């Protein structure tokens, strides 16, 4: 539910890991201190790969993906991209992008049914999100910031926000989105929302440097918390 | 249209604060954390002479000793802290030893540490004093006193 | 083991041969010498340069 | 957890000696010189701090 | 006389020489050397020599792939050279008088001699250095057209580049492939030795296998790897 | 505070006048020194891709002005060797300025960012929108 | 008010509920029981003085359910146990004393550090 | 007077003097220790150094960042005849 852990010595798991309904993609220079935060959590669900995307472990900023379509850039050697043919399960499709905005996690803000992309991307990849993930796309930005990917974490339920975001642009947001947004800050007031964190329906991980209040807020609009082994015997 | 109250809690403590470029974290969630020191040194070294008891200014100069209000302004120029972020808020030093060669002072800042929050904190420095000759004053000790 | 194209001409690089140049609007180019990347830089036109394949390929050799 | 009986046992080896005023060695607690030869075989012996 | 040796001398060598007719080098003459036995008791390492005369040694009996070996060579010469490319010493500036490449103070008043550890100009190169830890990558035979495939390039080519290498020719023999530089220039006499201590650490024991070999021409700037398939690029030319 | 990174050439020594990707105001970056350099008789300590250098703002807004504060090089004009074989170098030298633990300051990097610079930082790499 | 639970982080365990909690909440500010004494070995030598911090950096709860083979299986005189998940020192049993971080005293108690544990309101959520 | 800037020192002191070899074949100083209880094998060779070419190999090494990657490295090929014995030579032990 809401579980806090760390790579390395780093509390931000957004640019290490990529979380969906489906699949879970990690980095592979770990411990073991952090994928079995993880696989404890998930069990065998859904499919747990380590992998690296453009000979880099920064896979969370550089893939976009949901529940049907995993998008990866241009860079990927295809021995990176026909190991992850078979790892994850034949429902997702997986079609490499040519861009000139490669990092495709701080450019496509996606969830299951609504995505926000960069404002300056082109015709040609709009036409082929639709496409590969089954969304509707829309160039939007949060207010002061052109990239939604770091600034913006959705879900099917909520979205956490940025912090600094003025209130008249969030409800034109929530009408776009159709899911009730809260800005907020996570990691002991780290302005960076959409790489503080990982979510899904099930789960949703989060630094370990992030606060009591603020593991409260995060649970709350995503919706995600909800007990005889507890009394006394003395 | 769902939840959108929706805050700026400062960290750790609960207090909704303002959504908008300020503080960060309830101006007293922040007054425990920062720490506006942070380069100023813990130790110094003054140079005296144990022949004429007088103090020295880096430079050249030889400013006497009273331990009040003039030589604890020529101890606040050596204190390698910069005029950056104190301007000053207030000194005093403690008594602790006659002969043992250490000075203790404390002291105030009252510095700077976001873009709007004035902040003071306070510590105390512990001068270790250094004894060697008054070249005006090893001087007599040569015959060649008057000039 | 991939083997690029020129990005001037026409040439394969194999690993380990000539540089690459990465322009400020964020565009990948390829060179297989110091030939095809010192005529990159005085603005010379590659259709207009006999021994390359884009010239070839124009003036159907 | 540490069980004094145990305690008494690692005390005699570690805090149950004396040292040296002039060269810091550890010296055993009924001693009358120290037994080096740096500091000319010292009568100056004292009881090793306890805690 | 054999018997003299079984009976006595406790460690025995083995005089060896190269066959330098199978080598592209413009020399006639054979080049002889010393080479120990470390088998076991050495009334058996005699009745192996002994057997092995007028006999031929081949390379990979010696040694296999993936072990650390060192090198053994005469350094590249230079002749005389001056002080600054020597030792690395500093230029003095441009306002000096009579020089600048130079070292300024060979040394104080006192000792009255020129010391021994000051820098000063001399010979530099064709030294004698002993290299360690160079560690083996293909240990090839020579009658063989796949020197120079591998199991992920399945092309037939040998291990010489287009138009040979620079002044020494065709490797038409067996050869070692080692990683890294070795003291000593092109058609230098090289003796290669085996590894003094056992190596563990995690370099020694790394196994490896190649992805593709280089075989474009060493004489300039070259872009192709085998004249079969520079007449596929080119096509149809005049001649 | 920095990980471990693989030795690139070193093209930017003390005096450097840098430009500055991210929009916190300032236009150039002054480098000054380089945190975790080394020590040799008249060598001038040099900064590298990815590298923590010491940096003042020479133009730009004048609250940013006359006070030393760190930064991380993102670009570099001097060629440098990646492992996989291929010699990349950028057009110009580009600097962002960042904490002394290392989050960044600025709100989004125009630009590309250097690739091993991307993955020493993590922070870099969330406002970074085009890496190599 | 309502009822609360203090959930385990990294192990997201309920280790205690409310109706427990022997909070102690006052100290005592005196300068014997207020303040931290650090003796020496000889005389009632006092060579440090502390002054308490600002909360009390500890649950003093009731034995539980989940602490029941921790307690019963090698029962020592002090030790510390874990969440049910991630085997942390989450926190320790003491039957001697170790009064608050803040300071009282309490009783042979079961102390529980508020450092890597936190508290959630197991009623509804706070809809700001 | 002192030095007034410490430095380290220009060149390596156990490499002299930097004279001409005496021949073009160096010699090996030190053969590795024998084993006795593993069969007869040489124990060094002959051979002659012709150029360099440049490989690319899958680099295997865990805990490093290229772990599974390709890697270019540079590498000598040396021409190795097979070599023919034409003596032996036995050495006895001395005080000298």
Redesign the interface.
Known sequence: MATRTQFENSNEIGVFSKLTNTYCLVA??GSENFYSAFEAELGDAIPIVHTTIA?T?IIGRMTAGNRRGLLVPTQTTD?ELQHLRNSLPDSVKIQRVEERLSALGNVICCNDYVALVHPDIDRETEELISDVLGVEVFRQTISGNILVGSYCSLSNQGGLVHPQTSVQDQEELSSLLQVPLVAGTVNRGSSVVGAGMVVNDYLAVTGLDTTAPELSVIESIFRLQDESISGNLR | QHQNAATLLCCNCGTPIDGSTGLVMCYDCIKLTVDITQGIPREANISFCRNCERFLQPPGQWIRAELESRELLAICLRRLKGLTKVRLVDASFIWTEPHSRRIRIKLTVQGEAMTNTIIQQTFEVEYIVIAMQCPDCARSYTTNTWR | ?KVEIDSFSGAKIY??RGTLFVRGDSKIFRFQNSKSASLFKQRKNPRRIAWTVLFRKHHKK | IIEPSLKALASKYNCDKSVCRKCYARLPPRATNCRKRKCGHTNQLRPKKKL | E?A??KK????????????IR??P?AQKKA?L??????????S???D???E????????D???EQNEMIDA????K?HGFEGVTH????KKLPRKTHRGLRKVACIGAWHPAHVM??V?RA???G?????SINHKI?RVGKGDDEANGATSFDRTKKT?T?MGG??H?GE?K??????????P??????????????TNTS?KAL??????????AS?FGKGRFQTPAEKHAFMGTLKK | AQG?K?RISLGLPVGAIMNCADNSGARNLYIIAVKGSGS??NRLPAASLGDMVMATVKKGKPELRKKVMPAIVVRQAKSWRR???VFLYFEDNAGVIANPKGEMKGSAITGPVGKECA?LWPRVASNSGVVV | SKVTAVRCKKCRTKLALSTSFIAHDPPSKESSEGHFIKRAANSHRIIDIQESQANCSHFFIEPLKWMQPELQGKQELEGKFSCPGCSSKVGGYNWKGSRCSCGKWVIPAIHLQTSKVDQFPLQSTALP | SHRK????R??H?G??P????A????????????????????????????????????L??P?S?????????????????????????????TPR
């Open positions: 592979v220079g000979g472990r021995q | 083991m690993p380990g | 054999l003299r040796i006595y001398a406790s460690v025995v060598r083995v005089l060896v020489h190269t066959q199978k080598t080098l080049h050397a010393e080479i120990q036995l470390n088998g076991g008791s050495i058996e390492k005699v192996w020599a002994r092995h005369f007028e006999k031929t040694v081949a390379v009996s010696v040694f053994i060579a005469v350094t010469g020597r030792w690395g010493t021994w550890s820098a001399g010979q530099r064709y030294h004698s250095r002993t990558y291990i580049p290498f620079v020494y490797i023999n067996d050869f070692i492939m080692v990683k890294g530089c070795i000593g220039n092109r058609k230098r006499i090289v003796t290669l030795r085996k590894s003094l201590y995690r790394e196994e490896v296998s190649l992805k593709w070999i280089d075989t060493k | 471990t693989f040799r008789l492992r996989d074989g993955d | 800037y410490e430095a380290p220009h060149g002191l490499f002299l930097r004279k001409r070899a021949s073009i074949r160096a010699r090996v100083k030190a053969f590795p220790k024998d084993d006795r209880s593993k069969p007869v094998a040489l124990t060094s060779f002959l051979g002659y150094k012709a150029g360099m070419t440049t490989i690319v190999r899958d295997d090494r805990g960042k290229f772990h599974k990657r390709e890697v270019v490295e540079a590498v000598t090929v040396v021409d190795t005849p097979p070599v023919v014995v034409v003596g032996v030579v036995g050495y006895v032990e």
